[PDB]
Design an enzyme around this catalytic site. Structure first.
Site, PDB file in Angstrom:
ATOM      1  N   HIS A  63     -75.691  59.848  70.247  1.00 56.70           N
ATOM      2  CA  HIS A  63     -75.384  61.011  69.631  1.00 56.70           C
ATOM      3  C   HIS A  63     -76.728  61.479  68.862  1.00 56.70           C
ATOM      4  CE1 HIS A  63     -71.292  59.156  69.888  1.00 56.70           C
ATOM      5  NE2 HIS A  63     -70.975  60.312  70.573  1.00 56.70           N
TER       6      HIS A  63
ATOM      7  N   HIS B 116     -80.621  59.839  59.880  1.00 53.87           N
ATOM      8  CA  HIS B 116     -80.712  60.615  61.226  1.00 53.87           C
ATOM      9  C   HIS B 116     -80.683  62.010  60.958  1.00 53.87           C
ATOM     10  CE1 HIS B 116     -76.591  60.968  59.622  1.00 53.87           C
ATOM     11  NE2 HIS B 116     -76.351  62.092  60.463  1.00 53.87           N
TER      12      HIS B 116
ATOM     13  N   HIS C 149     -79.824  65.962  62.951  1.00 48.65           N
ATOM     14  CA  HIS C 149     -78.967  66.865  63.851  1.00 48.65           C
ATOM     15  C   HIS C 149     -80.062  68.158  64.188  1.00 48.65           C
ATOM     16  CE1 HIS C 149     -75.278  65.072  62.661  1.00 48.65           C
ATOM     17  NE2 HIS C 149     -75.841  65.019  61.591  1.00 48.65           N
TER      18      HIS C 149
ATOM     19  N   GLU D 135     -76.266  71.602  60.335  1.00 52.80           N
ATOM     20  CA  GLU D 135     -74.971  71.830  60.292  1.00 52.80           C
ATOM     21  C   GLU D 135     -74.639  72.569  59.097  1.00 52.80           C
ATOM     22  OE1 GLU D 135     -73.981  67.083  60.499  1.00 52.80           O
ATOM     23  OE2 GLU D 135     -73.215  68.020  62.602  1.00 52.80           O
TER      24      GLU D 135
ATOM     25  N   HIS E  61     -80.064  63.826  57.280  1.00 54.70           N
ATOM     26  CA  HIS E  61     -79.174  63.356  56.428  1.00 54.70           C
ATOM     27  C   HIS E  61     -79.434  61.629  56.102  1.00 54.70           C
ATOM     28  CE1 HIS E  61     -75.903  66.056  58.397  1.00 54.70           C
ATOM     29  NE2 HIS E  61     -76.726  66.710  57.238  1.00 54.70           N
TER      30      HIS E  61
ATOM     31  N   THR F 205     -69.875  64.308  59.296  1.00 51.43           N
ATOM     32  CA  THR F 205     -69.747  65.455  60.343  1.00 51.43           C
ATOM     33  C   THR F 205     -69.550  64.813  61.802  1.00 51.43           C
ATOM     34  OG1 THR F 205     -72.080  65.497  60.630  1.00 51.43           O
ATOM     35  CG2 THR F 205     -71.245  66.568  58.759  1.00 51.43           C
ATOM     36  N   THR F 206     -69.555  63.746  61.877  1.00 54.01           N
ATOM     37  CA  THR F 206     -68.934  63.183  63.346  1.00 54.01           C
ATOM     38  C   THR F 206     -67.590  62.432  63.272  1.00 54.01           C
ATOM     39  OG1 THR F 206     -69.928  61.076  63.537  1.00 54.01           O
ATOM     40  CG2 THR F 206     -71.593  62.577  63.916  1.00 54.01           C
TER      41      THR F 206
HETATM   42  C1  LIG Z   1     -70.387  52.873  60.705  1.00 56.39           C
HETATM   43  C2  LIG Z   1     -69.755  54.206  60.300  1.00 56.39           C
HETATM   44  C3  LIG Z   1     -68.235  53.992  60.514  1.00 56.39           C
HETATM   45  C4  LIG Z   1     -68.121  54.761  61.747  1.00 56.39           C
HETATM   46  O1  LIG Z   1     -67.203  54.722  62.743  1.00 56.39           O
HETATM   47  C5  LIG Z   1     -69.445  55.364  62.203  1.00 56.39           C
HETATM   48  C6  LIG Z   1     -70.202  54.412  63.168  1.00 56.39           C
HETATM   49  C7  LIG Z   1     -69.535  56.705  62.741  1.00 56.39           C
HETATM   50  C8  LIG Z   1     -70.881  57.177  62.789  1.00 56.39           C
HETATM   51  C9  LIG Z   1     -71.545  57.295  61.424  1.00 56.39           C
HETATM   52  C10 LIG Z   1     -71.528  55.762  60.631  1.00 56.39           C
HETATM   53  C11 LIG Z   1     -72.115  55.922  59.357  1.00 56.39           C
HETATM   54  C12 LIG Z   1     -73.476  56.455  59.369  1.00 56.39           C
HETATM   55  C13 LIG Z   1     -73.748  58.019  60.233  1.00 56.39           C
HETATM   56  C14 LIG Z   1     -72.915  58.934  59.226  1.00 56.39           C
HETATM   57  C15 LIG Z   1     -72.732  60.360  59.773  1.00 56.39           C
HETATM   58  O2  LIG Z   1     -72.192  61.261  58.984  1.00 56.39           O
HETATM   59  S1  LIG Z   1     -72.919  62.648  58.540  1.00 56.39           S
HETATM   60  N1  LIG Z   1     -73.457  63.199  59.882  1.00 56.39           N
HETATM   61  O3  LIG Z   1     -72.222  63.499  57.677  1.00 56.39           O
HETATM   62  O4  LIG Z   1     -74.179  62.043  57.714  1.00 56.39           O
HETATM   63  C16 LIG Z   1     -72.050  60.174  61.100  1.00 56.39           C
HETATM   64  C17 LIG Z   1     -72.856  59.220  62.047  1.00 56.39           C
HETATM   65  C18 LIG Z   1     -72.870  57.763  61.620  1.00 56.39           C
HETATM   66  C19 LIG Z   1     -73.795  57.035  62.278  1.00 56.39           C
HETATM   67  C20 LIG Z   1     -70.147  55.432  60.747  1.00 56.39           C
HETATM   68 ZN   LIG Z   2     -75.458  63.685  59.939  1.00 53.00          ZN
END
Ligand SMILES: C[C@@H]1CC(=O)[C@@]2(C)CC[C@H]3[C@@H](CC[C@@H]4C[C@H](OS(N)(=O)=O)CC[C@@]43C)[C@H]12
Ligand SMILES: [Zn+2]
Length: 258
Positions: free
Chosen positions: A62, A92, A94, A104, A117, A196-197
């Site tokens: 992603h 990361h 976007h 975003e 972010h 946001t994901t």
């Molecule tokens: C480990 C946690 C729990 C989960 O299911 C994960 C893997 C979904 C994806 C998450 C990650 C936490 C860190 C990141 C936050 C980002 O959010 S943002 N775009 O608002 O900064 C979404 C992308 C991201 C890698 C989450």
């Molecule tokens: Zn993000």
């Protein structure tokens, strides 16, 4: 048939697996600069990244995540709208297929070429997994990217991307200093929102800096050479990995500045 950014699995589909997609505090949002009220009770942001220890960079299918060793209290965000101390775990981006889209958050409906972010978790909850279950569990520092002059502090990231082209690839990425990605001003907007994901958890205090950073056309073009697909799968360029602005609903965006 996992979530992603395409016609068949993109943001307009996410609510089916993640009903919170239509929740009361979803992100991102449009920042209406004329409606955001200056809050003189807000504090200056405290961004303390002197001891940040990067470990690795990962293509997760992603985006790419620059991961930090968060086993000690080193790289912390505090002050601004926050109560207590939030530890940096990863950053990361976007970005778009073209310079006219990719952010975003939007500012008076303006889309930036990309958005950074920096994700932090509230140390009072002990670990990231417990923090995302709490309405004040995360603080995400959002920084807009516009295309112009190169950002020298970004080039070490750009140069490693060739080594993590496809989903599931990772590379050693030590000694990267995220202070090199910050604009001059820490003027910000803040509101309560979400990841946001998927899983779109409503656990984020958003802190969005007003001042963008400039990156070069060549820097963002290298972001757009990454792949959503795994090695030896049909090539899907990693572009347009942004969720559109969501309804503000019963929320106020506060400005740190006049
Ligand atoms: C480990 C946690 C729990 C989960 O299911 C994960 C893997 C979904 C994806 C998450 C990650 C936490 C860190 C990141 C936050 C980002 O959010 S943002 N775009 O608002 O900064 C979404 C992308 C991201 C890698 C989450
Ligand atoms: Zn993000």
């Amino acid at each position: 048939h996992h979530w992603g950014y395409g016609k068949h699995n993109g943001p307009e589909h996410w609510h089916k697996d993640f009903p919170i997609a239509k929740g009361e505090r979803q992100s991102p949002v449009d920042i209406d600069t004329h409606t955001a009220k200056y809050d003189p009770s807000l504090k200056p942001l405290s961004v303390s990244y002197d001891q940040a220890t990067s470990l690795r960079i990962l293509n997760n299918g992603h985006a790419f995540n620059v991961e930090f060793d968060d086993s000690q209290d080193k790289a912390v965000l505090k002050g601004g709208p926050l109560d207590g101390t939030y530890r940096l775990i990863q950053f990361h981006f976007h970005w778009g297929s073209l310079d006219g889209q990719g952010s975003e958050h939007t500012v008076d409906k303006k889309k930036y070429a990309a958005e950074l972010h920096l994700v932090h978790w509230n140390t009072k909850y002990g670990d990231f997994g417990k923090a995302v279950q709490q309405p004040d569990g995360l603080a995400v520092l959002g920084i807009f990217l516009k295309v112009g002059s190169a950002k020298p502090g970004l080039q070490k990231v750009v140069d490693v991307l060739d080594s993590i082209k496809t989903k599931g690839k990772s590379a050693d990425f030590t000694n990267f200093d995220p202070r090199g990605l910050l604009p001059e001003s820490l003027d910000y907007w803040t509101y309560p929102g979400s990841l946001t994901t998927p899983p779109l958890l409503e656990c984020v205090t958003w802190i969005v800096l007003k001042e963008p950073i400039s990156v070069s056309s060549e820097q963002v073009l290298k972001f757009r050479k990454l792949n959503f697909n795994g090695e030896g799968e049909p090539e899907e360029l990693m572009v347009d990995n942004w969720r559109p602005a969501q309804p503000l609903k019963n929320r106020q965006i506060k400005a740190s500045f006049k």
